[PDB]
Design a protein around this ligand. Structure first.
Ligand SMILES: [Zn+2]
Lengths: 99, 128, 60, 78, 112, 154
RNA sequence: AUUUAGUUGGGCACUCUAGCGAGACUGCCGGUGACAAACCGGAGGAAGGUGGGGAUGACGUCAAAUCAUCAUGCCCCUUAUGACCUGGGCUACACACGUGCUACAAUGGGAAGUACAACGAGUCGCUAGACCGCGAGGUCAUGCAAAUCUCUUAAAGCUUCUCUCAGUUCGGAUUGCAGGCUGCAACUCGCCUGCAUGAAGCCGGAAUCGCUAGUAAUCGCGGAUCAGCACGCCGCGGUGAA
């Protein structure tokens, strides 16, 4: 009800520690928070050849990995909105809230 | 009434077997036996656990298969059924382990290597 | 023959099919990732130092 | 395939125009690459430029569809 | 000899045997067989004189000629004789969009 | 290969005849992984078997094995820079594999218009000392024993 | 229960999503072996003998390759070997060699109807639906900054007819005509559609290449760079051998 937020980061340990912190602060003044729903964690690849002039027969690659979590909140209080705007850190994850 | 469970997997294809005391058929994705399973002869293929346990019927089978190719998702039907026959009676697990049909095929498509044509095929290389 | 050309590519183009892609800290015309504005190999050099977020090695 | 008509530049038009009632001039120095031919350009005498030489050629009325690029062969196979 | 131009042979059906002349691909054949109201008939050509005359007159509504070869010749005669740069390389068989050939002469001449 | 002997991969029997031999027969027809087309034309070959002089659908295949299957073959066992190839008894699985090769891999050459008359009637012919694969074995045994004297001592 | 329809009421049961965990170590038994390392079988199990792959490359060899990614010892140029712009060229062809794609047809071509994947991408980017067109496509427009909307309903597949061994309804190069799309502009020099055309080619000597099982062989799909352009590269999945 009128709030659901998203979590997107690179390291799942920072993800679920900040997710457990906000679940701890979730039903503080409110109630009925839904847990950390996982997401399929998009991934990219690249390709860089291991030389500077020749030698395409030997290569190298890397990866992007984007871990995504999800926490829903049902039937909230008004007091948690000003509480969650007092909740700002860590900085490795970026939240994505709606109403 | 009660229903009998079971699941089977092969070749990036998953199946959810739902065994019921019936008459002996199979319904897959709310269709018939050989409307969604095409012209292939894979009946006694699937009925091979029945030839070692409760020959031949009479249990109708519900299953909802998805993913993979047709033969791989057909072969995964064998193992949910054999898991169900283990669920019914303990006295067939010897008859299954003599026949197999319980070990999941862990063998699937192999990772390539960046630098070849295929997973192990090398390109032509003229000596002279 | 490139110090005039890097300053040539910082200008607004004469028309649409002239603003191609080269690297930023070097000036390579070929094989530049447009997501990163880096070439093949300066990306490789900065990838090891932990100075590009995101990127790790890839084994699977 | 140039479905919205022909294409002739407007910095091709600006050499002479008064040769419509008189006998035409001989100097038409240009680039002669982009512009095609459409029937208002019949019977002139154009120095078609091939990257090095504004090669002179005059016009017949059935040398009419293609561009000015047939008559700049930049290969020199002799 | 035979019915139109030359050599409409039997022992093949109608859409097959009509392909044998200079001017029929397959769309011309299906459209001409659609304009009369006929069929495959059957795997040997056993048409009647009404049907042969109808499909004889309908082909005459086209460019299907032995002068269609001469029509191609006057097309390429218009081509090669203006200047022509496309005639120089038309006789050397390279297309007007270019194909950049140093070993693709074995299509036409076989330089080996 | 170099170190020791390798495993040999026993197979699965049929979905109908419950035969490993007919399964192996299908697998030396199969091209590009199309198994169902080769299996279905082999069941069609058994249907042609059953109609024209229907005796037994599998004994005709066993008699096709009878009139083809070798017992002898020469093998170049030189010792000190010679050319003394020895007529040697063949391994039994290689024997059956050469039989399947001489049945199917020679049957490309009948050249008849119906696409499995080169299969069904061909293995009908091999049951009763006909088909040119029998005479392949005959000339194979005749080029065998050409060095019966000066090679059988090794 | 409903609705075309897991839609909407409901549950987290199965599946799936992915965090924390358990699980395969000669672990037990029998033979061989100096009783030792170890070798051969058996039970259990999802896999038993480093379960299957990947990343990981010592001392050193070849004055191997690189000033043309970068930095740079020394030497040379400087109203010019430096700079701006137009047009051309690296895409030529009497020839020889290397690497790939498509065929030489009956396990096939042509027509009709009929199913099942995986990876990834998306804001000036992917397009739902509708209308029209022989088509490449054209127009109005709806969802989409994402397990939701699209790319996208995959090809080999399956059932009926067909052709009847031919240089052939195999083959599909070459050439005229008509077009479509992005580009300010497809002549030199983009891709694709349609009509008309239809060549070699019936399994290739000497010689030579890759590969020990989800491999080889065949079949499609996605991405990078990119207005536009892929038989190349990188990756995934289907059928599945001796
Ligand atoms: Zn760089």
């Amino acid at each position: 009800q009128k709030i659901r937020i998203r979590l997107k980061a690179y390291e799942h340990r920072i993800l679920d520690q900040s997710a457990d912190k906000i679940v701890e602060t979730a039903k503080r003044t409110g109630a009925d928070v839904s847990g950390p729903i996982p997401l399929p964690t998009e991934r990219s690849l690249y390709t860089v050849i291991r030389a500077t002039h020749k030698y395409k027969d030997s290569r190298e690659q890397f990866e992007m990995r984007t871990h995504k979590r999800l926490i829903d909140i049902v039937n909230p209080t008004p007091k948690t909105v000003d509480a969650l705007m007092k909740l700002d850190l860590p900085s490795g994850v970026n939240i994505e809230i709606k109403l | 009434q009660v229903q009998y469970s079971g699941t089977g997997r092969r070749k990036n294809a998953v199946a959810r077997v739902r065994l019921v005391p019936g008459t002996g058929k199979i319904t897959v994705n709310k269709k018939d036996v050989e409307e969604y399973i095409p012209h292939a002869d894979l009946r006694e293929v699937i009925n091979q656990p029945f030839g070692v346990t409760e020959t031949k019927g009479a249990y109708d089978v519900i299953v909802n298969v998805n993913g993979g190719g047709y033969a791989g998702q057909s072969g995964a039907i064998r193992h949910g059924i054999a898991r169900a026959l283990l669920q019914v009676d303990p006295d067939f697990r010897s008859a299954l382990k003599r026949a197999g049909l319980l070990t999941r095929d862990a063998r699937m498509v192999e990772r390539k290597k960046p630098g070849l044509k295929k997973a192990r095929k090398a390109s032509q290389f003229s000596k002279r | 023959a490139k110090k005039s050309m890097i300053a040539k590519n910082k200008r607004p183009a004469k028309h649409s099919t002239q603003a191609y892609t080269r690297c930023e800290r070097c000036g390579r015309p070929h094989s530049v990732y447009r997501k990163f504005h880096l070439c093949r190999i300066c990306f490789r050099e900065l990838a090891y130092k932990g100075q590009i977020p995101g990127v790790k090695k890839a084994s699977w | 395939s140039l479905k919205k008509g022909p294409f002739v530049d407007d910095h091709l038009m600006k050499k002479v125009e008064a040769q419509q009632g008189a006998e035409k001039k001989k100097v038409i120095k240009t680039w002669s690459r982009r512009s095609t031919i459409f029937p208002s350009f019949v019977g002139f005498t154009i120095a078609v430029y091939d990257g090095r030489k504004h090669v002179p050629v005059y016009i017949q009325e059935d040398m009419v569809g293609h561009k000015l690029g047939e008559f700049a062969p930049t290969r020199t196979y002799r | 000899a035979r019915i139109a131009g030359v050599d409409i042979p039997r022992d093949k059906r109608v859409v097959v045997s009509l392909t044998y002349i200079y001017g029929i691909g397959n769309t011309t054949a299906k459209k001409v067989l659609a304009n009369v109201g006929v069929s495959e008939d059957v795997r040997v050509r056993d048409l009647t004189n009404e049907q042969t005359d109808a499909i004889r007159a309908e082909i005459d509504k086209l460019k299907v000629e032995g002068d269609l070869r001469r029509e191609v010749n006057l097309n390429i005669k218009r081509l090669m004789e203006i200047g022509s740069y496309r005639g120089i390389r038309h006789r050397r068989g390279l297309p007007t969009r270019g194909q950049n050939t140093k070993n693709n002469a074995r299509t036409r001449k076989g330089p080996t | 290969p170099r170190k020791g002997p390798v495993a040999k991969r026993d197979v699965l029997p049929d979905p109908i005849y419950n035969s490993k031999l007919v399964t192996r027969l299908i697998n030396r027809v199969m091209v590009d992984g199309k198994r169902g087309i080769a299996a279905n034309i082999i069941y069609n070959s058994f249907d042609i078997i059953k109609e024209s002089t229907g005796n037994d659908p599998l004994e005709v295949f066993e008699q096709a094995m009878k009139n083809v299957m070798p017992v002898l073959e020469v093998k170049a066992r030189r010792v000190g820079g010679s050319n003394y190839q020895v007529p040697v008894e063949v391994r039994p699985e290689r024997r059956t594999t050469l039989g399947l090769r001489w049945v199917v891999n020679y049957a490309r050459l009948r050249g008849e218009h119906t696409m499995e008359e080169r299969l069904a009637k061909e293995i009908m012919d091999a049951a009763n000392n006909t088909g040119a694969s029998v005479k392949k074995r005959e000339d194979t045994h005749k080029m065998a024993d050409a060095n019966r004297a000066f090679a059988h001592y090794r």
